[PDB]
């Protein structure tokens, strides 16, 4: 038996594998084996055959594929090039399956920012230089839809930085109708928005400048419009604009989501710039004028009296089989998010689930069943389990399909469904070794094991792993949920050093039953430390009071919760009081800096990796969702009295390590620059390190360097 090593974590050795089937029908799915071959599996017949060999993939150096619903053409993608967290560009080739040769005559240009098949048939829509092009057939000249697309100014069919990162969390902004006879897209205008500029060095004599339109807290915002166009005769009347509700089009507003109900019925969701109110609208198609109409009687309003609307994002509706009623998750009269059924009016909604727990997600609404996720089982808010409810049946029914499958190995589930919910797949992430299984779909009976991760289990037999526990504390009528990681051969009669890992971000959760082998695991296994994570007020999935306790006051209660948890841990009786440390990343940097400079004398050293300095330096959407406008009339006082720099005097008797990357676009380098300037102006000693031309993720060898440096720092403090 041997302990973990740093090189084991850095060069990923103990990493699991998952299996998400690529459903192409109600009974078939595609996969890529460990031979670069694309194989089609049929469940009913049980046979399989290859639809694309590795020779064809290697012929054009392809790395990804996409199959048309007709199973006549495939597209292969090469020349991958990442731009932001979600967006990238590539080069696409089209392969004909019937004739076994590439399509010749009209090749797609390059690079291409997004590409999608139609749901029915084989016709393509793609985005090239912020413009949308439509192809009726893969061997036809394209038809151009938009003309005003300009780099860094106007975006057609794709989001800008703000919407991609904070609102949509996707790389595309175009949607096909269910039968593919209409196409809906969004146009973003970024012309008055201020620009953030930084320096990129590269390998050349002179460095260059990178400019991004970036609205900070209180600045101007993009302008978004929505269009729908007919894909059979696009030249008849051209694109049509969807009307905005009168109550929304009175000030600045946002765009939340779009979802198709039918070929003549679409749904849109709007948010006000003040995130207190959200509106859901349903629009229909008028054939006598070839246009779209949104009646006022089909508007639904959701508002929150004590905080923002929804969680991190606004919930999306799932429509029934009759396409006139839907199901949605929002908070009930007791402040718990549950499922409601809406037919005509919001005030007539029917509550489907109730209790002192929360519903997380809605997966599928079939003709007679509803699948969802919850943490109801045994009142553990860190687990996820899948429940199935019968709808439209004479006796009501409700069952839990995952809480007794593998009780001691799997308590954190996710699901993926096929067409018409004939079959589905369950993926389990912890607390045991992750697993992936295929289920019947009508009787919830196991069929085959897609992924078992036997090699990892064989590799982990000769390794001593730390012991993890999840418990709770009750302090001052507030319940805190903590996860404790203890070294092997733990003895309660000795004293151990303590390290705290903090994120603390709003609408987040850090205490989950998820399997992972990471840096803190190595720290506990080899260096003999005790690690702890604490979840307190401001987090999600425990009620509206706990979630909204931190409204308009950021950086006040998280520090108190961390300090209270540390004091309780010290009172437990096996913690060395003179060796305690704390660290975090990009919101735990903020909380770590605020807790280290709290003047309580509890922490000895702290680490802040790419922290946020002041809320005036971050994006408008995220900041204004939880803080409000930074004006003298509304919330300027707390904007001023919340920065890290204001505590610069209290860093005198502690050890501080500050790390940031110079080419960061999410949390800009100016935060760390201002922190360092404030610390210097007060004559306080600290340490620092920068990474050149590195983004927010610090990918590559920068990760090895960062973790080695942090290990050295921690080993020096606890010596």
């Amino acid at each position: 038996m041997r302990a973990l090593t740093l090189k084991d974590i850095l060069n990923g050795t103990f990493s699991y594998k998952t299996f998400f089937p690529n459903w192409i029908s109600g009974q078939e799915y595609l996969h890529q084996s460990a031979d670069n071959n694309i194989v089609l599996y049929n469940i009913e017949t049980g046979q399989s055959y290859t639809i694309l060999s590795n020779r064809t993939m290697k012929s054009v150096n392809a790395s990804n594929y996409g199959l048309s619903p007709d199973r006549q053409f495939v597209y292969l993608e090469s020349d991958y090039s990442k731009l932001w967290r979600y967006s990238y560009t590539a080069t696409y080739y089209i392969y004909d399956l019937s004739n076994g040769e590439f399509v010749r005559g009209n090749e797609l240009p390059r690079p291409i920012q997004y590409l999608c098949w139609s749901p029915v048939g084989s016709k393509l829509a793609y985005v090239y230089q912020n413009n949308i092009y439509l192809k009726q057939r893969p061997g036809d000249p394209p038809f151009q839809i938009t003309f005003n697309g300009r780099e860094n100014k106007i975006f057609n069919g794709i989001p800008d930085w703000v919407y991609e990162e904070e609102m949509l969390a996707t790389k595309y902004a175009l949607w096909w109708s269910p039968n593919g006879k209409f196409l809906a897209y969004a146009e973003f205008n970024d012309t008055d928005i201020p620009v953030i500029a930084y320096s990129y060095y590269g390998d050349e004599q002179y460095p260059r400048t990178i400019n991004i339109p970036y609205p900070k807290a209180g600045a101007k915002n993009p302008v978004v419009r929505i269009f729908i166009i007919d894909t059979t005769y696009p030249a008849y009347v051209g694109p049509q604009e969807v009307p905005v509700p009168a109550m929304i089009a009175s000030s600045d507003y946002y765009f939340s989501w779009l979802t198709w109900v039918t070929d003549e019925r679409v749904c849109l969701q709007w948010l006000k710039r003040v995130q207190n109110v959200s509106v859901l609208s349903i629009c229909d198609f008028r054939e006598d004028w070839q246009t779209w109409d949104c009646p006022k009687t089909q508007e639904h309003i959701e508002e929150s009296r004590t905080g923002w609307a929804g969680g991190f994002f606004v919930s999306t509706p799932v429509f029934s089989y009759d396409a006139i009623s839907y199901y949605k998750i929002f908070s009930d009269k007791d402040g718990y998010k549950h499922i409601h059924y809406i037919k005509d009016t919001v005030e007539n909604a029917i509550q489907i689930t109730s209790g002192k727990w929360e519903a997380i997600n809605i997966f599928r609404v079939t003709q007679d069943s509803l699948f969802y996720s919850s943490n109801e089982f045994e009142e553990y808010p860190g687990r996820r389990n899948i429940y199935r409810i019968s709808i439209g049946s004479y006796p009501p029914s409700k069952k839990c399909v995952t809480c007794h499958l593998r009780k001691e190995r799997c308590q954190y589930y996710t699901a993926s469904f096929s067409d018409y919910a004939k079959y589905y797949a369950l993926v389990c992430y912890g607390p045991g070794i992750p697993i992936s299984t295929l289920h019947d779909g009508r009787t919830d009976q196991e069929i085959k094991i897609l992924e078992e991760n036997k090699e990892l289990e064989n590799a982990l037999k000769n390794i001593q792993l730390p012991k993890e526990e999840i418990k709770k504390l009750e302090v001052d009528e507030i319940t805190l949920w903590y996860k404790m990681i203890l070294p092997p051969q733990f003895d309660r009669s000795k004293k151990y050093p303590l390290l705290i890992q903090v994120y603390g971000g709003p609408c987040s959760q850090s205490v989950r039953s998820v399997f992972a082998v990471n840096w803190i695991s190595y720290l506990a296994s080899k260096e003999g430390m005790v690690i702890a994570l604490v979840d307190g007020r401001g987090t999600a999935f425990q009620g509206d009071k706990l979630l909204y306790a931190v409204y308009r006051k950021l950086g006040v209660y998280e520090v108190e919760d961390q300090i209270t948890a540390v004091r309780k841990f010290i009172e437990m009786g096996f913690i060395d009081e003179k060796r305690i440390a704390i660290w975090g990343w990009s919101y735990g940097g903020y909380v770590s800096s605020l807790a280290l400079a709290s003047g309580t004398g509890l922490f000895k050293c702290g680490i802040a990796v790419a922290p946020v300095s002041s809320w005036e330096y971050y994006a408008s959407v995220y900041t204004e969702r939880f803080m409000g406008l930074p004006t003298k009339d509304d919330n300027l006082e707390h904007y001023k009295n919340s920065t890290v720099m204001a505590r610069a005097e209290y860093f005198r008797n502690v050890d501080y390590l500050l790390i940031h990357g110079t080419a960061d676009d999410n949390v800009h380098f100016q935060n760390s620059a201002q922190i360092a300037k404030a610390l210097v102006n007060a004559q306080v000693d600290f340490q620092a390190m920068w990474y050149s031309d590195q983004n927010h993720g610090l990918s590559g060898l920068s990760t090895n360097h960062l973790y080695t440096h942090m290990t050295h720092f921690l080993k020096q403090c606890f010596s």
Partner: nanobody
Amino acid sequence: VQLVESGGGLVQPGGSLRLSCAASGFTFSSYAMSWVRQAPGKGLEWVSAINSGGGSTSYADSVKGRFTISRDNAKNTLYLQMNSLKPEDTAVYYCAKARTGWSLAVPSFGSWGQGTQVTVSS
């Protein structure tokens, strides 16, 4: 259904023209009428629409302020007059019959005739 279009031809830019549409078979004065054009190498483009009574007219954004459409139910004729032409309207014009006479309604893809060719160049 029978429809015949007359007029058009080759004309220099900046001129003016007018063309007529005559329909038979169905009952006139009970449906809205429309004028559509087809350009070489392009698809069908809707130009203008006229109500079944002749009170209100609708025009596209590309021919706004330059085309005038009228009808006469006594002679069962439809007239469209173009003025201040530009060297991009060279196309063949078709006469379309709607399916709703209760009010104005753009015909989607109903009956099509042979149309008349109009070419403008220097």
